[PDB]
Symmetry: D2
Subunit: 124 residues, 4 copies
């Protein structure tokens, strides 16, 4: 339903690139390249979306994860984005995210960052 719509190349307000393919079964797979932080080149992402959403004008729920390890860098961290795809003229993926990095137990209290990313198909 929203498979073709979600599938494609997305950019957030930071200039990050999210290249994703939505599967018929609810899979999300692709690559993420962050414009910020301890990150270089593309990282693997996987996630899930609701492949049969409400038809009442509601968005499509989805989420995905990046672990920040590739051949170039390892930031000992993972980000999860949770949010919704909104179709139509101004297609957009509005998210909140959590970034956890590996800490000792004594440091676990400041292990997790929160933020928000909005993605569109136009590079801003």
């Amino acid at each position: 339903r929203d498979q073709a719509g979600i599938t494609g190349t997305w950019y957030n307000q930071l200039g990050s690139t999210f290249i994703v393919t939505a599967g018929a079964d609810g899979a999300l797979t692709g690559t993420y390249e962050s414009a910020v932080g301890n990150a270089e080149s593309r990282y693997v992402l996987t996630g899930r979306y609701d492949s049969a959403p409400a038809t009442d004008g509601s968005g499509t729920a989805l989420g995905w994860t990046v672990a920040w390890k590739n051949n170039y860098r390892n930031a000992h961290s993972a980000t999860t984005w949770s949010g919704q795809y909104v179709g139509g003229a101004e297609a957009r993926i509005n998210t909140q995210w959590l970034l956890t990095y590996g800490t000792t137990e004594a440091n676990a209290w400041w292990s997790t960052f929160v933020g928000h990313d909005t993605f569109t198909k136009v590079k801003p």
Copy 2:
């Protein structure tokens, strides 16, 4: 993967939910989640990522995963992402924070996302 063995297997949270996961050598997480609460019945597909080469200073291993709450029985038009870290040892744990987003209209988007925290252990 340094914790591929420690992570793979069955986990239980404070609410009585069950998470079965395989951790791949390449940083993949795949499995199923069965929730003890909410609009949830039976198992749901889970996918995520973990750091397959963590620090060796006693830091945890960062990870995350997504469940979209659609299976053959039920569709709650929502998805949860868990972001956290695995901590090995006698009392292995996965400590997470999570975001649950449900599909909303634009007018209801301000209240589309819940936040919480779950701790998983290997013992029921």
Copy 3:
């Protein structure tokens, strides 16, 4: 005394159409009223919070937060929101926040007691 006391004091507006009226004290206090354009809210609610009255000099923002409990002389939504964020000065002064809204639940329902979001405030509607 307070470095951004002048910049923060006044009326702010968010992306929802809500209105935040605040006074920053020299001692770090935030006092004022919040009027929400959405939810189980009517008219103005008391707000109280704190800000860093001696921020860093290097162009960093000024950290702040405040709370609104959603009870007033009209309604009681058995809930409270906290906003955490920073004030950025200049033209297009802004207060960029993340928020948590907790509502009172039984223990059985506490897992879904807390919403999260983000609000941006500017001096112009």
Copy 4:
């Protein structure tokens, strides 16, 4: 006047060993001091917040929140924390919270300005 005014008023301790000393006013006010056992913090910091002074009578918790800006006479960590949560009274009284900690950043570093966590406070040390 407040339903849980006496229940909330007093000293609370979290899982980190931090100490929260609070007075609940009749009108919904929270005032007091916070002393963190961790981070760039020393001694007591001013807190202010709000609680629902007339909660539901169905065994629901009492929604509340408060803010600390991490500046006192000893130290300034250019940051503020807000706790959003609920009070549950009775045998083992507890305040269960989620929190947001924002530190002052430049605009380029704003994306990593806010930490999130959860604290549970009880009356015992």
